[PDB]
Amino acid sequence: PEDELKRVEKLVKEAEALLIVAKIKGSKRDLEKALRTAEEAAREAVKVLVQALLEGDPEVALRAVELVVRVAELLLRIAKESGSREALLRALIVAEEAAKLAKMVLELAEKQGDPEVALRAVELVVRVAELLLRIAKESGSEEALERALRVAEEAARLAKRVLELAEEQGDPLVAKMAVELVKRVAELLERIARESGSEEAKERAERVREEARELQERVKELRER
Amino acid sequence: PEDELKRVEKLVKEAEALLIVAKIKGSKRDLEKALRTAEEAAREAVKVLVQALLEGDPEVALRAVELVVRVAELLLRIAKESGSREALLRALIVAEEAAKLAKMVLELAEKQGDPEVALRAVELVVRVAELLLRIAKESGSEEALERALRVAEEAARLAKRVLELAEEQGDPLVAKMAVELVKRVAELLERIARESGSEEAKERAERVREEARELQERVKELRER
Amino acid sequence: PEDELKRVEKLVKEAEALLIVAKIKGSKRDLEKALRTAEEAAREAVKVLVQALLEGDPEVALRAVELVVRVAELLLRIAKESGSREALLRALIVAEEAAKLAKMVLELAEKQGDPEVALRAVELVVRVAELLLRIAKESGSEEALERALRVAEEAARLAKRVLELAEEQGDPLVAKMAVELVKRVAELLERIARESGSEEAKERAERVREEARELQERVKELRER
Amino acid sequence: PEDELKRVEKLVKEAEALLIVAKIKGSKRDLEKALRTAEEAAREAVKVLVQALLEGDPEVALRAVELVVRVAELLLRIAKESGSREALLRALIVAEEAAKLAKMVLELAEKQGDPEVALRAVELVVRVAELLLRIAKESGSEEALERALRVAEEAARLAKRVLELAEEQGDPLVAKMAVELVKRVAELLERIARESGSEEAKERAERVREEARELQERVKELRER
Amino acid sequence: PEDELKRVEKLVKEAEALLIVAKIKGSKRDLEKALRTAEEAAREAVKVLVQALLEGDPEVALRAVELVVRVAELLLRIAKESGSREALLRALIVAEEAAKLAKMVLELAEKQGDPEVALRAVELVVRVAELLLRIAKESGSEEALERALRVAEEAARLAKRVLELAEEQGDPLVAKMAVELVKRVAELLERIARESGSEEAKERAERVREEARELQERVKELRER
Amino acid sequence: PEDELKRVEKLVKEAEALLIVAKIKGSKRDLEKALRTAEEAAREAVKVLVQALLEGDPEVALRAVELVVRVAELLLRIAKESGSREALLRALIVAEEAAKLAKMVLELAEKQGDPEVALRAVELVVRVAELLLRIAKESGSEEALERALRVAEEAARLAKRVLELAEEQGDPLVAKMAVELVKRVAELLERIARESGSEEAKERAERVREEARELQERVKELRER
Amino acid sequence: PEDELKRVEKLVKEAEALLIVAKIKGSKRDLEKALRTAEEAAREAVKVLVQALLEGDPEVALRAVELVVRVAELLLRIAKESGSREALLRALIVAEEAAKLAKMVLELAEKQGDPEVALRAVELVVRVAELLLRIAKESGSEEALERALRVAEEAARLAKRVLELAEEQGDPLVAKMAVELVKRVAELLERIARESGSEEAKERAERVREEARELQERVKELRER
Amino acid sequence: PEDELKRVEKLVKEAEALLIVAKIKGSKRDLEKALRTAEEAAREAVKVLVQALLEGDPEVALRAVELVVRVAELLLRIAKESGSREALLRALIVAEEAAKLAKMVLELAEKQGDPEVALRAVELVVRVAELLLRIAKESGSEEALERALRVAEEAARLAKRVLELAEEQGDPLVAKMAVELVKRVAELLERIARESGSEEAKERAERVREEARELQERVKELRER
Amino acid sequence: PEDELKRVEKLVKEAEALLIVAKIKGSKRDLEKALRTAEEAAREAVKVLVQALLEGDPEVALRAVELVVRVAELLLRIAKESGSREALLRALIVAEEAAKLAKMVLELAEKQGDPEVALRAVELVVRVAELLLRIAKESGSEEALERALRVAEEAARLAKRVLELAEEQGDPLVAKMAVELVKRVAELLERIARESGSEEAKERAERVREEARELQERVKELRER
């Protein structure tokens, strides 16, 4: 609930402080206390979401996954400072964690039938795929790009899955609000080909642009009553 | 209540700011924060109205739907800026939302018997049908005009329904104040034929001008005691 | 109370402004904001009076009904400008409203026994019957004259009712101050026969001039102790 | 107690509101909610008094019967509005109820020996006999005058009964304060002969004026020590 | 205490208002609300004093009896207006009440030993005996003069009783301040012989002038150490 | 404290006003309100001092006793006007009161060791002994002269007692400032022999002039280090 | 604890009040209530200390014995007023009581090893020996001087005992802070020879001045490491 | 915020005062109070910035770093006075501190995307590199020049980093406004070769003039749409 | 915390007052209340610091030790007045106390790694060694000089210990800011040889000037990367 998230926002908020004083003072006692403090917020947030996925409260769930992403952003701002690989390699866990959790909220909407609550989740997954870029381009790491393609296709499979609800409930507009989402995916996967030059990026990006074109005026077939 | 609406007016008021600074600076970080901030106000307003439709407080309800319309006006001023289709296609949801809600207040007046409170609602629905024009003529979109005809006839069916209360309570003047409303509807539907040239607009506009003439000095039959 | 009326005088005062700028500029955005702003003052004034009819504060009540009449005068100055029938037909509601409310203050004086406070009310009702003339002669409407006769006889029934208090409390002079009021009524109803030529006006005006003559030196019978 | 009466004053206070808005709006949904709301206060007040007649707290009892009379005044202001006979005929029940209850407080004072608390009760009974006049003269009903004579003699029997306490306790002045009460009764019963011309009114009024004269300087016989 | 007396001064202060408006307007609804409002202050004042006689707070007691006398003065200004005998005969109760209470404070000083607080009480009793004159000479009533002699001797018995404390505590001056009080009593009782010509007044006035002379330089016998 | 004394100076200041208007108008309603108003200030001043003797604030105490003396001067200006013995005999109480209180401040200085604050007190006691003369010579009373000798020796015992502090603290000059005080006492007691011719005045005045000579260059024995 | 001492300071503070009003008014009802109220504080203070000697809280103990001494000072200010021997002879009990208790705190410090807390106690015992002088010189009593010598040597035995802790803990300065204490004792015992001329005072004072000289640079032998 | 900076400007403003009076009077008590007072402002300013880097308020951050530089200027004006090395060596800490902090604001702009707010920061870093010259040329110290090269290249790395935002947001002019900044850097590093003759200055200055020439009409490639 | 220090600054601030009035008036009641009041502040300050050494709040600790030094300065200004040895010998305890406490804050910085917070502590210890001079030169005492050498070497051992942190964290400048501190120590110990002529002062001062020279450009070895 609300008061349980305020503890997590506090733990997060108590960690940028330990970071900036560590950027000022150069101390490493504090990063080691910021990192270990951010990991708490990434572990105290799942304790919230897991209570809220049992109840039918997804509006609280999304306000927890939105925190877990702010921890992965945070844990990236540490690795740039320290240059370590034990903090950077923690953010790819919290980032996979917040993608494997956004899917778990989408599942909660399919039974409840809440496309506006299912679509907010897929945006969070795209914040993650757009985050792992910033980890991969900054660090130059390769194990992130392997995941950003994983997480990105893990969303294009869901925009299709969100569209199966709009078409089911006769809400033609969230479909449009989801078809245009796949455009924001296909634009992303192309960015994984431009930087990190290869063929799987261009290929997988090309598989999705057809899965965009698969989501044609098919959607327009519904509002003709 | 009052303090709960001030939070929504705040959220709205905190979004034109993010828009004008985004029109000045050209930033897209802020539209993405304005859009996502306007959607909150469109979701925090229903949380108000839904509390107020349970109570017998329609005077507060209309002060919430009047906010939800100001969000649809807002979300149109973003699409003109960005040129996106995920913001424009959000305003047609908030606009349908504020029509499907104004009807829900009219229902609350039929049991309470408040024609002055039922007639203010139908004006809000006409602000919506007059809004979707500005979306359809500006954008050139077609899925709005399909709705503006839907929402407009969804009001002419209610002006008749408001007249069934005046005639029931012996208030001959709100009937007049509603008969002349259908004239403001029929003038609107004609505008959907002038622009967006077709026959359904002219036809449906012609069905209503007869339903205006159906609402003849029928109303005058009542105040003859 | 006082500070609550200053909000209503403000709302009224903020509406002549929107009118004159609309007469200068010819804009119709402003009438639609003046009308909708005057209606507030006609609805925020009843919220005052209704609080004051519960308390024994009629001196505040009359300072509210005097505002509601200034709104009906206002809403007539709009219809002359726009030529609409949805503003003119709103003033006949506020005008009936301020007559159905002045009676409600007179009732408060009968229990308190305040003929000077009961007689000020009947003057307000005569300002209304004298107002609906200006609506009927200007517009040429007929539904006002049907009401001006209604409101006018709705006062001659009360001047008699005020006289039943003076005669009860041994205040021979307010009776005189009320008997001469019926003369101001009978002069009015004659004016509804001169213009709007008919027999009900002349008839009903003639029924009251006898009800004036019924209120003979009957009043003089009291101060002979 | 105090907080239990504030609920009843609230229920009463929540009913004049429903009445004035019903006099403004002309609605009948609200009278049917005011009447049914006043009856609550007439039933929630006996729940107070009955708790207070068991305890020796008559000062609270009189503050409850004073409410039940304000409900009978209220339920008369509805019948003048609606013109119904199911509200008017409810006020004669609450009015008999508040007379059959004032006697029940007088009984509580005879054992406690509180003439100042016994005399306040008989005033409440005279407010009732003076109320049923306003029901009988306004409505023209006859079943009230049958009760006003019943309730009025039901007080003249008690002023005598109050005098039997003053004479018992050597408080010569409350006797005077009660002997002069019977004068206020005899003046009342005469009023039931003047209006509602008959002989029982004049007769019963004449039986009491002798029972006034029976209460001669008999009272003066006591303070001669 | 202080805030509890401010409620009583308020109730008193809210009653001269109802009186002057009743002298202006001639209304009798207001006297009947002033009288019934003054009686409250005479009953809410004993609720104060009785709380303060239990505690050792006579300085608050005298500030309550001083109010109860201001109510008896008030209830005399009503009888001159109305001419009633149920208000005049209420003031002789509040006046006896404030004499039977001043004695009850004097008793509280004998145990505490406070002659300056015992002597202020006897002055209040003399304000009462000097008040009942104004009731008896104005009205011409006889039942007051029977009490003014009762209350006056009820003080001369106490000035002697106050002197038994000064002589006990070796405070020779309050004795003088009390011996000269009996002179103010004997002057009073003579006034009850001058007006209301009789022998008991002259006799009882003569019994006290010897009880003044009994209180000779007896008092001077003490300060010779 | 300061704001609490301003209430007492106000009460005093509100009493000379009532006196001068009573000397102009000759009214006795006002003396009876001035006397009873001065007694308040003599009773509200002890409430100050008693709060200040508990704290170590003698500078405030002397600013209260200086008020109580101004009330005894005041209450003498009334007795000259009225010629009463109940006001004159009140001033000898306030005058004894302000002597029995100045001693109570001197006691507070002995523990604090403040000879300059102890000597100001003895001056106040001499203002009292010099005041009772003006009461005794004006009135011709004898019970004052019995007190002026009491109060005067009640100071010569204290000038000796003040000298025991100067000699204790090695402040040779306040001793001189106190030895010369006894000269102002011995001059006073002689004045009580010149007027009011007797032997106790001359005797007691002669006992003190030796107690002056006892306070020889004894004081000079100290400053020889 | 703290809130339990505030009750004792209250009881003390409620007793100077009863004293000053008794010095003003001369009443003996109040001394008999002040004395009996001070004895409470002397008995409610031991109830505190005894709870605090069981715990290891001497900082609270000294804040209780400091109260018991303020009661012995108080009970001396009564005997000067009344002149009684049952109040004076109560202060020598509270004064012995606060010496027999200060020793009981010193014992608590020897086990805890707190010389700064042991030395504050011996100061309290010297406040007692310096108090019994003021009882003996004022009253002229002899049974106090027998105790002041008892209590004074009961401290010089403890300053030696405090020095055995400083020497044990290697805190050379509290020893100095205690050696100079014995000088404040020896100066005291000499004062018991100057006044109350005898040989035991001079003798016992001379035994201690050698026990001062016994406490030579013996103390200086320690800080030579 | 604003009121928190006014405390820091006050602390600064309270330190030039202590300096000028120390230059007048020659006192060293005041430098030791000015230095220790300037260090507060350098420590109370980071407490501001650190609160403002958490919020998105860089406009306040730059108004704090601008203070910290005014303290380093101040702490240089002390070392010229005293000639000490503990004040001069404090200014190189506050100067490094205000460079390590300006970078921390630039980081805040990269996420917000505010090139005008990122470029103001790099100017502050150049005020620092231009300050350490005045420390190095005045004092002749070498440990400053080692830092001025550190801080100067720590800016040329950021002007490039600012240009990566302009090129990202399509703001071609702030790039120009940053390319010309590197010219102000390269001119500076040359000044570190002219004075303090060496090769690293000339070398590092030459590495940057090529990094200026690297920032060619590359910038002009963008505004060709 | 802050509000807990304001109580200690109050206790201190309430003691200079008692001193100046004691220098004016010459009273010894007040020194005995100032001394005993300063000792409170020296004992209420450790209660703060001890709470703050448990938390990681050294910024509050230094604001407490800075108070305890202001008490040792205060307790020296008393001994000059009284000439006592029980106040002077209390200041050497508070002065050792504030040195044994500054070390306890330095310990808190070694675990936190805060050289700027560790160096402020050693300055406080040098304020103490510079204070005991003013005690030793003024009084001429020898037991202070034994401590000033103890406290002074107790700092030169810590400046070395502070340098072990700078060298550990790569902060070359606080080392300089600490190396120059030992110069301020060696200058001090020489002052203990100039006055108080001996060889241990010159010797120990000479041991430290070599420990200054031990802290050579050793520090310069670090910033060569």
Side-chain angles (χ1 to χ4, degrees), chain H residues 75-89:
Chain H
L75 294 166
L76 178 57
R77 290 192 280 117
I78 290 165
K80 295 197 261 84
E81 182 63 27
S82 70
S84 68
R85 186 166 179 267
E86 189 170 1
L88 188 282
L89 196 66

Side-chain angles (χ1 to χ4, degrees), chain D residues 3-221:
Chain D
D3 289 330
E4 189 67 26
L5 292 166
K6 293 181 188 292
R7 188 183 67 180
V8 178
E9 298 180 354
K10 184 175 186 288
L11 286 172
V12 172
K13 190 182 286 185
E14 289 178 354
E16 292 91 2
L18 298 173
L19 180 59
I20 59 174
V21 304
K23 293 175 77 68
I24 293 166
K25 303 296 185 185
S27 69
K28 268 63 184 299
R29 296 289 187 274
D30 291 328
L31 297 177
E32 181 66 25
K33 192 181 287 290
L35 177 59
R36 267 71 185 181
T37 304
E39 293 176 353
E40 283 289 330
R43 288 188 280 103
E44 293 293 328
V46 177
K47 291 175 93 292
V48 170
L49 177 66
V50 170
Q51 291 291 320
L53 294 172
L54 300 174
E55 296 291 327
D57 294 331
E59 294 173 353
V60 178
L62 295 163
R63 295 179 62 244
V65 182
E66 182 175 2
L67 303 173
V68 181
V69 176
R70 287 203 285 114
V71 173
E73 296 180 356
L74 179 64
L75 294 166
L76 178 57
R77 289 192 280 117
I78 290 165
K80 295 197 261 84
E81 182 63 27
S82 70
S84 68
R85 186 166 179 267
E86 189 170 1
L88 188 282
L89 196 66
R90 182 67 179 171
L92 281 74
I93 294 169
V94 181
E96 286 183 349
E97 177 176 356
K100 186 175 75 175
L101 286 171
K103 188 190 288 179
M104 287 164 60
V105 171
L106 175 59
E107 291 176 355
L108 180 62
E110 294 182 353
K111 66 185 285 185
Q112 291 181 354
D114 292 332
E116 288 291 331
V117 177
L119 198 148
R120 279 190 278 164
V122 179
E123 296 180 355
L124 299 171
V125 174
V126 169
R127 283 179 60 185
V128 169
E130 187 174 1
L131 179 67
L132 298 176
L133 289 173
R134 292 197 285 110
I135 293 168
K137 293 181 180 182
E138 180 63 26
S139 69
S141 179
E142 297 180 355
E143 299 182 355
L145 300 173
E146 296 178 354
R147 289 179 175 84
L149 292 170
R150 188 177 298 278
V151 175
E153 286 181 349
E154 183 174 2
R157 292 177 186 177
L158 302 179
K160 185 180 183 293
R161 187 178 172 184
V162 165
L163 194 148
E164 294 176 355
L165 280 72
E167 296 292 327
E168 187 271 329
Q169 297 186 359
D171 191 359
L173 292 160
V174 306
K176 272 74 182 299
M177 232 185 292
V179 169
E180 295 292 330
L181 195 149
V182 179
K183 270 63 182 297
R184 294 179 63 242
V185 170
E187 190 273 331
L188 190 65
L189 296 172
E190 289 177 355
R191 192 180 296 170
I192 291 165
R194 295 177 70 257
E195 295 294 328
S196 69
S198 178
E199 293 82 2
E200 292 178 355
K202 190 266 181 186
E203 183 175 2
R204 293 178 180 180
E206 183 178 0
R207 300 292 296 163
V208 172
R209 184 66 61 80
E210 291 182 353
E211 186 65 26
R213 182 62 176 171
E214 180 64 27
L215 301 176
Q216 200 253 326
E217 292 180 355
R218 174 177 177 174
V219 64
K220 188 180 282 184
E221 295 178 354

